[PDB]
């Protein structure tokens, strides 16, 4: 009846990580005095480097460098000595205007509700009644374990840790007629970039005693749980510098840490005709509004589009067995109680106000104060 | 009973699958000449530049400019009026040496059989029965569709076809006691990229008579199917000068199309000791001898690793309740029959050969004459 | 009594060249709506890259990758089978603000006419009798032949012909009581750009008959003039791709073909504040009034500044023994009636129309239609 | 009888000096390896970024990151507070081979000694006896702030001084029958980086005391020479954060300091059968030649090359009246006794020695221990 499953999440210092916000502070920059910017920012992060490439077309003035400059400020590097310097890295530019066949395909000359789809593409939401905020218990650990770190970072309690961290969570569950029971940590790991003063053995200390133990519940870990911290041994080097970084490489972390399913598109940096967030946003949603409305307890929502198409080509509800109703009454119940089209969705759910870089580290699910978050009602 | 699913791909010329491919060939160039080479490189695309970022610890002597281009080359980039031109582009490379901190927690005086994993992570490897090769019909499906755009764009059959294509395919199902049968096609999209001088009609007529009625089978297309073939309009504009790429934004079409799971890890341009490709690899193996050994019919696996420690952290089999065997049973066997060290597994299979160029389109997965598609015969 | 002098000239498609009227379609397209526009633009080409660096800190919206490919196109670069393409190249852009210590004590809160000069540094004007437009015969005849190609290339007489193009032009002299009298045309060099179609001697027999006699008036040209035309034997890779451009790397092609002397400052893609430009413009004006007034034959002017000064630090004339006057007095003459402030020369000079992508290529001086080439009448 | 010339010089940490010594350092990496390297590197920088630009054809094995930032410490940018770091920078590589064409043309299947010239282009000497190292005095002293400034920093004496420099400066001096003699400084500009704690008063204070007179003489200084001393009044940020810098922006500084005359070529990342180096030094050799065997007191030397030819074109000498013999008489003395030939030059002056990176800042005449400054000894 028991088994293991693990999920991971990254700091807002890892690289990848720092990308994902910079195209979202991006995307802000110009949802602020454009409301109907076409955004696709992708942002690549090395030693010394912030590239932006991709398409904008937009009626706003945007000061890159500042945006850039701003964003890696609040994350951390902010000297040499950490292997990182907003004040002195190099920001390179190459964004041109969306392709006018793209644009002439998805939204010139139409109606805002019957906007197509800026692509093809699936996407899958997913819900699970293990923790209050219907997210699997393994990603809010690990996300949690990464805020944690950032607070004592920021706080001056470790003035030894630096941006760049990463943890994973190992959880033993119990099966329960198709929902999943938590019942114990089996494994925790975390890694997390540091100056060359402090000692392995005060590193690991501090993780257990200030880290681990003031974010997981007592009665989840015990004499049996295994600990690896710092398991490399020393993570001096860190950040662009150790390891490149790339806009939407971390799509897991992203969203449900190995649970449920995903259909490949990254969030960051695009604006609401992209349905790779739009969608993926709404089928949250729509799995949220199903646990929560006591219609089951842990289910997985697809959607999917094609360029240009503005209704869903194709939408499936897998609910564990944990219903007593049918997949197809609850298919039913979603279609009747949401409409899909990106064009609605960024109604619904205020898609052109500029909270995305929000979103970009800790998960863009679970979290506090989004429309996506907050259940809808449902009539059958 | 029934229900639908929905899977993507994308062709050789797509801008992410450019840069995976791009990203494998200096993989491979490293190989040849260093079989323990570490590798790490990113590549990322736009209008007239290829850029590799990363990092690699090689003897090789590689000449970047021509296996950058030779691959272009071979993709059929080769003229401005395609939109890319491998003899006339931009190659900027910032690589640097694997961070000395990785090496020393990761390989450095260590056995070849007791190398720890190169990060931390998790990977799920999927099987099903539902085709000979053991993959989801709605990605084979739709990777074959690639695959037939490109050989009709070679022949000269169709000989204002480009590079950059993609096609999504959703299939109704119907469950059989948790594996799954494949009743019809619901839906097809196709797009692709194409010279100004061929009009819609004929364009649509072509994608009809001569990709998909060669590629899928009549039993499965009906009255009812779904047509969306260049349901944008128009597509002169494509590969980087349309849309932005990236080396790991395609992971679930190298993958499982949605089926199954996935932990977040891209593949290309990573040597074997990045367990993101090693365990994903390992995982599949496993699943597949699952299947071909008759214990299931549809079957996923998770593993995951810390950075520096070679034993996984965690195994976990999910069999959708296809086997008469349970889960726990199953591991066991898992356990008894595979290591899944990334320093047991290199040699299992044959991971510092140089192949990794030939996985980067179509899918890792399903292929012909891969190691961790052929079953290991399982005791127990 | 006779002497050799010889000059170099190359064409708008010669990659230096290039990014000089790249970095001053920058300069006017800000000028256009901003004239107090501050701007220090360099230009990088390599193969299929376009790279902007720089500060500029200006009011006007700017796009970089329109104003970059549009002259480019003008240049006649619009095929990858010529080795670069507007259409398809890559531009990258790294500019910045104005370092705000540079703005603080070169012009903020400062009266226009008081303005400090951008930047240290020396300038030279320099005027001959020997042309009408008072410039030395070996650079006249050297931009000539590359005009006179830039002519028949585009107007299909030898359609063979690319953008990319040098000549060189060797007059024998004889001297003339500090003047120098032109006698004869000693060695003439073209090499330049061309399709693999056309062979070498159809090439030297065009490059004689239809190029240099249309342009060298046949009194210079004798049985013993030496030419060397295609003296490579191969001239297909071209542009960018054969060889790296950067801006102000022409500086005596922009200026008086070695005659005189240079103080080192680059022109392209600086505002009038910077007096490596308005400096040397004005002292040109000053030579050139100096010639056209009858006050000497031949003439070379130095001028110098300090950051942050209005003033010129020194002035000095040297005529050659040219001149009835001392060069004490010409001195006083030039300090009589010019005001060499970049604050004043800008008024005298129009310097924030925006006309400096006219002068980018075949020089700056001896031009049509510029202010410093219209003498000013001198009082004394 | 008296005239004012001014001529200037920058320090190592001009961003402008940074390119060319970082192009010399790849030139130096290439021929320890393989004298016979062709090697044409730009570089260009601005803020957090090195680029490498160009064409190399070599059978050495460099590593760019490394000799790079091995460069840059040099200097001394070595943390994010000075603007500019050498640990934490990126570096981007964009190389490739050097053109088939140009290498046709130029050298292949050629003897070593018949080497044709590697580009068309014009080339000067100059020499002066106004001083032993026979250079003009203004640059001399110039070229000894900058090198005095960055002695006092390195020695913690003046420990607010940071890398990037400039220095100007102004004599008066008297002719004497064609020939120069300084009489006094006039003027001399000091503009120098600095920390943000040091005040304006104290580093003028230090500017007069501690540099200028510890290196000008003081019969050169009295009550009239004018002083502008940090004239911008603030220069916190400086190095390539402060200006874009590029190879061969500084081939005045690298010179004569505006006396004599400049041909355009740039000296550094380019080997020696890139004539715009090798020919440059030959007829500086051949000036410093004239005026130590006594022949005349100043004399400046042209040359010129087209592509793919061994011989030059023209030589031309000016005597400015300081000899008794004709110039046609040192012309036939020069053609007597040199080879100009750049595979005969090589030889002479050992242009296949690793010894370029010292050439790359204070100027690349008038210095110690290279053999283009030791005089030959002329038979006529
Ligand atoms: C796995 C190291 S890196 C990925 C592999 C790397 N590209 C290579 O070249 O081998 C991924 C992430 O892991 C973290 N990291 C970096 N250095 C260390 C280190 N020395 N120890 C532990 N973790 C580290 C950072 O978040 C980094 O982005
Ligand atoms: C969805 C277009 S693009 C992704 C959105 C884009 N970044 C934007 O700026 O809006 C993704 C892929 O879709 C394909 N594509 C490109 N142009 C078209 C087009 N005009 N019609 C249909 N498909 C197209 C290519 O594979 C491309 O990489
Ligand atoms: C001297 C060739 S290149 C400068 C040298 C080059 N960096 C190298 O790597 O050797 C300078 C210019 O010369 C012209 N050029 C280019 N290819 C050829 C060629 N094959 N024959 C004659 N001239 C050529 C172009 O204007 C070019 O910018
Ligand atoms: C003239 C400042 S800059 C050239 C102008 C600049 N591109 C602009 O945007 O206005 C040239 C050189 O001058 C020095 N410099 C930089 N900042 C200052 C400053 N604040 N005061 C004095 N000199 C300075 C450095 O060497 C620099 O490379
Ligand atoms: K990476
Ligand atoms: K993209
Ligand atoms: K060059
Ligand atoms: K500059
Ligand atoms: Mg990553
Ligand atoms: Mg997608
Ligand atoms: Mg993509
Ligand atoms: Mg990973
Ligand atoms: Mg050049
Ligand atoms: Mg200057
Ligand atoms: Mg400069
Ligand atoms: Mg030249």
């Known amino acids: 009846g028991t088994f293991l499953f693990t999920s991971e999440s990254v700091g807002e210092g890892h690289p990848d990580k720092i990308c994902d916000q910079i195209s979202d502070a991006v995307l802000d920059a110009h949802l602020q005095q454009?409301?109907?910017?076409?955004?696709?920012?992708?942002t690549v992060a090395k030693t010394g480097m912030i590239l932006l490439a991709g398409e904008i077309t937009s009626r706003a003035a945007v000061d890159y460098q500042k945006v850039v400059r701003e964003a890696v400020k609040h994350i951390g590097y902010d000297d040499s000595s950490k292997g990182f310097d907003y004040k002195t890295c190099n920001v390179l530019v190459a964004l041109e205007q969306q392709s006018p066949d793209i644009a002439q395909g998805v939204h010139l000359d139409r109606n805002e509700e019957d906007?197509?789809?800026?692509?093809?593409?699936?996407?899958?939401?997913?819900?699970?009644?293990?923790?209050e905020e219907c997210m699997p218990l393994t990603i809010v650990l690990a996300h949690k374990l990464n805020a944690k770190?950032?607070?004592?970072?920021?706080?001056?309690?470790?003035?030894?840790?630096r941006p760049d961290?990463?943890?994973?969570?190992?959880?033993?569950?119990?099966?329960?007629?198709?929902?999943?029971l938590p019942i114990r940590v089996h494994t925790i790991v975390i890694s997390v970039q540091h100056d060359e003063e402090v000692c392995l053995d005060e590193m690991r200390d501090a993780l257990k005693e200030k880290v681990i133990k003031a974010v997981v519940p007592a009665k989840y870990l015990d004499e049996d749980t295994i600990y690896h911290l710092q398991?490399?041994?020393?993570?001096?080097?860190?950040?662009?510098?150790?390891?490149?970084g790339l806009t939407g490489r971390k799509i897991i972390v992203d969203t449900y840490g190995g649970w449920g399913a995903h259909g490949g598109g990254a969030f960051s940096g695009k604006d609401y005709t992209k349905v790779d967030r739009s969608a993926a946003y709404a089928a949250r949603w729509?799995?949220?509004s199903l646990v929560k409305g006591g219609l089951?307890?842990?289910?997985?929502?697809?959607?999917?589009?094609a360029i240009g198409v503005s209704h869903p080509l194709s939408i499936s509800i897998f609910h564990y067995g944990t219903s007593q109703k049918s997949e197809r009454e609850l298919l039913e119940i979603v279609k009747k109680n949401f409409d899909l089209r990106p064009g609605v969705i960024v109604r619904d759910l205020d898609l052109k106000k500029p909270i995305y870089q929000r979103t970009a580290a800790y998960g863009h699910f679970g979290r506090d104060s989004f429309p996506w978050?907050?259940?809808?009602?449902?009539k059958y």
Chains 1, 2, 3, 4 share one sequence.
Not at 149 to 161: D, S
Not at 373 to 378: A, H, R, S
């Open 149 to 161: 770190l950032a607070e004592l970072r920021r706080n001056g309690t470790l003035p030894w840790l």
């Open 165 to 180: 961290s990463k943890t994973q969570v190992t959880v033993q569950y119990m099966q329960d007629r198709g929902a999943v």
């Open 34 to 42: 454009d409301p109907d910017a076409k955004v696709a920012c992708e």
């Open 115 to 131: 906007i197509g789809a800026g692509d093809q593409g699936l996407m899958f939401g997913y819900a699970t009644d293990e923790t």
């Open 286 to 288: 729509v799995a949220k």
């Open 231 to 244: 398991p490399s041994g020393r993570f001096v080097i860190g950040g662009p510098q150790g390891d490149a």
């Open 296 to 305: 089951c307890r842990r289910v997985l929502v697809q959607v999917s589009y």
């Open 373 to 378: 978050e907050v259940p809808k009602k449902l």
